[PDB]
Specification:
Length: 303
């Protein structure tokens, strides 16, 4: 038996929870793995996340490495498991709360996030290809930081996949599925055309712009940085409702504040411009993830 299976994994430490499912650090044949455990009544959530992670050609350095979906019967109840690579730093939210980053550090985190999102969004046509995938719940709590200071995207259970041969989405999408704070203006006001797959890619870009703002605040230059905050910390309460968000984002047209200090550093000027070009109310005007990856690659090369 060479493949990783649940019976061979020993849970060691509780490390957190997702929307559904609890995440643990475990050991499989001497190596650390992350295990997301679901109950029997959460089978639909577990299966859908397993289905997205098993998508052909999905693997990428900036997408969480999937190992297996399996079941584990303890003799009383059955647990449904998703097993993946383990990343000791945890989420970008945990990482940015604990640490400040260098200019190099910021660019590495942003470029890797854009590279993972560009791979998710990328379609390779044909049966032996890859369908384009939109995340629908991108946020700093769903992006993990690897040992090398680069990111990988996780929590793919709310994703939607596009079949170009039929121009259809693999599921009948429900409105407003993700984290309210990161919902795009068109999702908040329900103007999004959910029959057009590009709509979901564009909504992910708005959320990525919010995550870039979170990283940039933590970029320390000459010992100067901002404290950790979630986007809209200055305008909405914790656990904001759709109505609270829509009033700020759609009606008042506010976005997270871009400090004047970011114009004094080239890397921060480039990041700020990307944010503004992710935050347009018109999803069609936003940058693509591939374009952001190209801009940040040019910046990482120049540094
Ligand atoms: N592969 C992984 N490797 C390590 C860790 C990890 C490592 C350290 C800590 C900090 C403890 O103080 C937490 C978690 N998480 C994952 C993971 O997939 N997590 C994950 C996936 N889907 C939904 C929610 C998730 N979590 C995101 C991080 O926050 C918890 C929830």
């Amino acid at each position: 038996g060479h493949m990783t299976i649940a019976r061979d994994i020993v849970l060691q430490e509780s490390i957190g929870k997702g929307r559904f499912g609890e995440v643990w650090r475990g050991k499989w044949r001497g190596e650390e793995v992350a295990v997301k455990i679901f109950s029997s009544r959460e089978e639909r959530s577990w299966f859908r996340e397993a289905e997205i992670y098993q998508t052909v050609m999905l693997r990428h350095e900036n997408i969480l490495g999937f190992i297996a979906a399996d079941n584990k019967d303890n003799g009383t109840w059955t647990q449904l498991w998703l097993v993946s690579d383990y990343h000791e730093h945890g989420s970008l939210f945990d990482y940015l709360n604990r640490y400040t980053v260098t200019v190099e550090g910021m660019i590495k985190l942003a470029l890797s996030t854009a590279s993972g999102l560009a791979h998710l969004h990328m379609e390779i046509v044909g049966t032996q290809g890859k369908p384009a995938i939109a995340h629908r719940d991108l946020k700093s709590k769903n992006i993990l930081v690897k040992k090398n200071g680069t990111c990988c995207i996780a929590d793919l259970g709310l994703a939607v996949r596009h079949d170009s041969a039929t121009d259809t989405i693999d599921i009948a999408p429900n409105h407003r599925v993700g984290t309210k704070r990161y919902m795009a203006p068109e999702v908040l006001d329900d103007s999004i055309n959910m029959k057009h797959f590009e709509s979901f890619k564009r909504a992910d870009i708005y959320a990525m712009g919010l995550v870039f703002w979170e990283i940039a605040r933590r970029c320390s230059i000459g010992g100067i940085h901002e404290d950790y905050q979630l986007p809209y910390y200055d305008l909405v309460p914790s656990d904001p409702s759709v109505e609270e968000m829509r009033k700020v984002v759609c009606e008042q047209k506010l976005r997270p504040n871009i400090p004047n200090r970011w114009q004094s550093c080239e890397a921060l000027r480039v990041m700020a411009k990307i944010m503004r070009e992710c935050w347009y109310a018109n999803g069609a005007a936003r940058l693509t993830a591939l374009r952001i990856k190209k801009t940040l690659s040019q910046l990482s090369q120049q540094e």
